[PDB]
Design a protein around this ligand. Structure first.
Ligand SMILES: CC(C)CCC[C@@H](C)[C@H]1CC[C@H]2[C@@H]3CC=C4C[C@@H](OC(=O)CCC(=O)O)CC[C@]4(C)[C@H]3CC[C@]12C
Ligand SMILES: COc1cccc([C@@H](C)NCCCc2ccccc2Cl)c1
Ligand SMILES: [Ca+2]
Ligand SMILES: [Ca+2]
Lengths: 310, 51, 51
């Protein structure tokens, strides 16, 4: 509390006025209020300096625990599928689709699932530098494996080569990431522009231009994959994998078009959660819409594991 | 219409789950905008896929 | 702005202290800062109340 002048009355006579919010008074009989320093805020009695609450997507927050659980589920499922293709390495179904591409795609899906983990926790400078590049590169690698696994795509580039396609498609975005991380790298940013009792930790993208190029290239590759899979969906080769690629790309677009309003309309820590969900969703789609059917046939009803069927 | 039912419900779930971290922490006009967008997306998904 | 006490100095010797947000001062040489009514908040300049 502070002293306030009464009109016409001497200095010894004063009214006690409670300290404004944000400022505090430690010593008794203080003639003025002292603003709490930066990083600190007034307490409930306006007497002390409580450290302002630090807000970020916590690992112990229910959202953090749940999204880590789902990302770990995705990691386990990808390891499951990879181990199934390893155990039955030379079965006709695993042999028909290029199995080296299958291992590459499953490793890339592991990277995609693990990239969401770089969004839970206190954002560090290296974490914010790694977040978008990691998912971008991993998901472009996934889309590239799927894009060479479909039809009339290897042929058009030719007019093995599979690795050349996947390498160029990943390498262009790696070049984007290197240019971005060298010119205007992201960082961590403590925001006090939100609720003043809280410091909220954000990642600061160096430039939305590089983020736009990253997202646009990842979307263009998926659009090419969808366009080429659309004109192949009727083919029963590899258990209608062309129409399943179409399904995976459609899920990708549903997830990343329902992400714009979800990202724009989200404020606070949970914004990171938004990203995680989208990441997970896309990854899951791909995995299921590419693998699970085949995996089922590999492990259940093995009579279809023949050269004729695939 | 198996794939169409499946994708209608996929659009439903995906849209409504993407808005969980928004509905969890937001206030004001944005809450109603989120609700309208989710409703319009689920309804448009059903309409499109089914018909 | 309100008046603030310089201890060890007479009452006529005051300093000018900015009114806290939500409190306005529409007068000259006002002792305390006046609080805005309900459904009302102080301006940027803290001189009056706006709804
Ligand atoms: C992380 C959470 C939110 C997702 C959990 C769902 C997926 C892990 C699984 C569960 C149900 C699975 C589906 C169950 C059944 C089918 C039917 C299947 O249709 C067939 O043509 C099979 C024909 C046959 O049975 O021989 C295609 C795969 C699909 C969509 C499976 C894809 C993978 C799905 C979606
Ligand atoms: C769609 O494919 C992708 C390619 C790269 C990254 C991503 C996701 C994981 N992050 C988007 C970054 C979100 C964003 C958008 C606009 C302005 C600021 C920010 Cl922060 C998706
Ligand atoms: Ca007097
Ligand atoms: Ca004196």
């Amino acid at each position: 509390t502070r002293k306030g002048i009464i009109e016409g009355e001497p200095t010894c006579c004063f009214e006690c006025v409670e300290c404004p919010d944000g400022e505090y008074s430690d010593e008794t009989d203080a003639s003025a209020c002292n603003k709490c320093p930066d990083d600190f805020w007034s307490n409930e009695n306006h007497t002390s300096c409580i450290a302002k609450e630090i807000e970020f997507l916590s690992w112990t927050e229910p959202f953090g625990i749940a999204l880590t659980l789902f990302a770990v589920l995705g990691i386990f499922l990808t390891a499951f599928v990879l181990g199934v293709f390893i155990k039955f390495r030379n079965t006709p179904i695993v042999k028909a689709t290029n199995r080296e591409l299958s291992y590459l795609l499953l490793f890339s899906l592991l990277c995609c699932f693990s990239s969401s983990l770089f969004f839970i926790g206190e954002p560090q400078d290296w974490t914010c530098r790694l977040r978008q590049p990691a998912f971008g590169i991993s998901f472009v690698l996934c889309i590239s494996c799927i894009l060479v696994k479909t039809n009339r795509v290897l042929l058009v580039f030719e007019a093995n080569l599979q690795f050349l396609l996947v390498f160029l498609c990943t390498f262009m975005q790696i070049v984007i990431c290197v240019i971005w991380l060298y010119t205007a790298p992201p960082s961590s940013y403590r925001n006090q522009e939100l609720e003043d009792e809280i410091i909220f930790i954000t990642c600061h993208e160096g430039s939305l231009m590089a983020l736009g190029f990253l997202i646009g290239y990842t979307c263009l590759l998926a659009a090419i994959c969808f366009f080429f899979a659309f004109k192949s969906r009727k083919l029963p080769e590899n258990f209608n994998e062309a129409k399943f690629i179409t399904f995976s790309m459609l899920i990708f677009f549903i997830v990343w078009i329902s992400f714009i309003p979800a990202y724009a309309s989200t404020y606070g820590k949970f914004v990171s959660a938004v990203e995680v969900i989208a990441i997970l969703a896309a990854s899951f789609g791909l995995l299921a819409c590419i693998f699970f059917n085949k995996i089922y046939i590999i492990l259940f009803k093995p009579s279809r594991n023949t050269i004729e069927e695939v």
